[PDB]
Amino acid sequence: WTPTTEQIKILKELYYNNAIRSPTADQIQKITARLRQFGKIEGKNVFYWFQNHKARERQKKRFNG
């Protein structure tokens, strides 16, 4: 799975406007339903997108990050 550009923009809006980091399972279902209007996507793709960003935040907080 690779998000479409529009899906990425929506995911970043949720991440930076709502400050979502670890959505509930109900949130993942609702987010997936909206993202599906812009292309293929499954709920686990949303779960892992937020998980991958947690790892990226940890990298940005290291000395050489």
Numbering used by the authors: 39 to 103
What do the study's own words say?
The HD transcription factor WUS plays key roles for plant development with at least four distinct and essential subfunctions: Firstly, regulation of stem cell identity in the shoot apical meristem (SAM), where it is required for non cell-autonomous induction and maintenance of stem cell fate via stimulation of cytokinin and suppression of auxin signaling. Consistent with a broad functional portfolio, WUS has been shown to bind to a diverse set of DNA motifs in the regulatory regions of downstream genes involved in SAM development and signaling processes. Here, we have combined molecular, biochemical, and structural approaches to address how the WUS-HD recognizes specific DNA target sites. We find that the DNA-binding preferences of WUS-HD depend on appropriately arranged sequence motifs in a direct tandem repeat and that homodimerization is one of the key determinants to achieve high sequence specificity.
As an entry point to elucidate the mechanisms by which the WUS-HD carries out its functions, we recombinantly produced and purified a fragment containing residues 34–103 of WUS and determined its crystal structure to a resolution of 1.4 Å. The overall WUS-HD fold reflected that of a canonical HD structure, consisting of a three-helix bundle with an N-terminal arm. Interestingly, superposition with the structure of Engrailed (En) (PDB code 3HDD23) and comparative sequence analyses identified unique structural features in WUS-HD. First, the loop regions connecting the three α-helices are expanded. Loop region I is slightly longer compared to other HDs and is characterized by a distortion at the end of helix α1. This so called π-helix or π-bulge is typically characterized by a single amino acid insertion into an existing α-helix (Y54 in WUS) and usually correlates with a particular functional role. Loop region II has an even longer insertion, which also extends helix α2 by an additional turn compared to En. Secondly, the N-terminal arm is anchored by docking of a tryptophan residue (W39) into a groove formed by helices α2 and α3, while a F, Y, or I residue typically performs this function in canonical HDs. Furthermore, this docking residue is shifted by one residue relative to the conserved DNA-contacting arginine (R38) in contrast to three residues in canonical HDs. Electrostatic surface calculations showed a large positively charged surface formed by the C-terminal recognition helix (α3) and the N-terminal arm, which represent the most conserved part of the HD.
